Structure formats: structure tokens, C-alpha cells
């Protein structure tokens, strides 16, 4: 039993809600919140900008030190950093940005990172300003993640579309 509230069960291990991941994190303080990151951990907009702003830019400061030491992530890759005031940990996961010309097959690789964590609060990877088909992202999530994932989808209209079209 966990403290996630009001989620619609989709499969054995995947749950979904129409919510801002930042607000879900502020309320639940999960062990792991997933950021929809880019390879440079430059948290400008979307999920990343919203999470970072909620940390008063501490996420960005920590991320800049990470990159200075380790260099960029891979598309499809991840790193674990602090969750600051939002969660114990933040799993920064890089889904392909098809507006940047990146390979959609890497979306499965991106979701595989979730399997290293028993429970996660996560956004829909590669959706939104990352440009991919959100129905596709949800399908890849369900078919790839085996651990318990609570998906927060900000946009009400797309949430309604995601639920109504889910197979
Ligand atoms: O609603 C669309 C959804 N954005 C969010 N989902 C949940 N909490 C959120 N809080 C702020 C935004 C946001 C998709 C998922 C990945 C991504 C990256 C950039 C923009 C949009 C998106």
C-alpha cells in the first residue's frame, strides 16, 4: 500500500492520473520522481522546467555539477540525482526528442530505466514538447515497465484521449 491517490489502474503495474507531476510530487513525496530530461540536464521547460522551478533551481545547480563531472547522458539513458524538496530521488530519463531528429526506438530503452526502481511517479516520456505520439508512449510504457509506475499527465484533454483509446 502506498500514498498515491485517485489513480486509474491500467494494467497489473501501471496507473494514470490527470495531474501536474510537480503537484503530485509535492503531495506524495515519492521515493522516485522521474524527470523528462535532455542529455545536457538543461531543465528549461515542460516537466523539467516545472520540477526545477519547484526546487528553486537547486535541481539545475546539482545537474550542472553532474554534467561537469560526467558529461552528457545518452538518449535513452538516465541518472539518479537528488529529489530535493519533491522526492527522495529524481531519476532523470532522456527519451528521444523527435523534434531533434532522434530515434523513436530509444523510447523503449528510456522506459527500461524505470525497471531499476520498485515504484516511481513519472511523466509520459517523449510526449509534450518532445514531440512523440503520446498514445505510443503509453503503449511502450505498459509493454516495457514491470515495476509500479504512477503516471501523471498534465493536459486534461490528452489524458481523456489516453484513457479512452487505451487497449
Ligand atoms: O501534459 C503533457 C506532459 N507534461 C506534463 N505532465 C505532467 N506533469 C507536468 N508538469 C508540467 C508539465 C507536465 C508531457 C509529458 C512529457 C513532457 C515534457 C514536456 C512537456 C510536456 C510533457
Swiss-Prot record:
What this protein is reported to do is described as:
Responsible for the cleavages located at the N-terminus of the replicase polyprotein. Participates together with nsp4 in the assembly of virally-induced cytoplasmic double-membrane vesicles necessary for viral replication. Antagonizes innate immune induction of type I interferon by blocking the phosphorylation, dimerization and subsequent nuclear translocation of host IRF3. Also prevents host NF-kappa-B signaling. In addition, PL-PRO possesses a deubiquitinating/deISGylating activity and processes both 'Lys-48'- and 'Lys-63'-linked polyubiquitin chains from cellular substrates.
Q: How is its activity regulated?
A: Inhibited in vitro by GRL-0617.
Cell compartment(s), UniProt: Host endoplasmic reticulum membrane
Q: What chemistry does it catalyse, as a reaction equation? A: Thiol-dependent hydrolysis of ester, thioester, amide, peptide and isopeptide bonds formed by the C-terminal Gly of ubiquitin (a 76-residue protein attached to proteins as an intracellular targeting signal)
Full protein name: Papain-like protease nsp3
Its encoding gene is what? rep
**Membrane-topology annotation of the record:** Multi-pass membrane protein
Subunit composition and interactions: May form homohexamers. Interacts with N protein.
Q: Where is the Macro domain?
A: 1-167
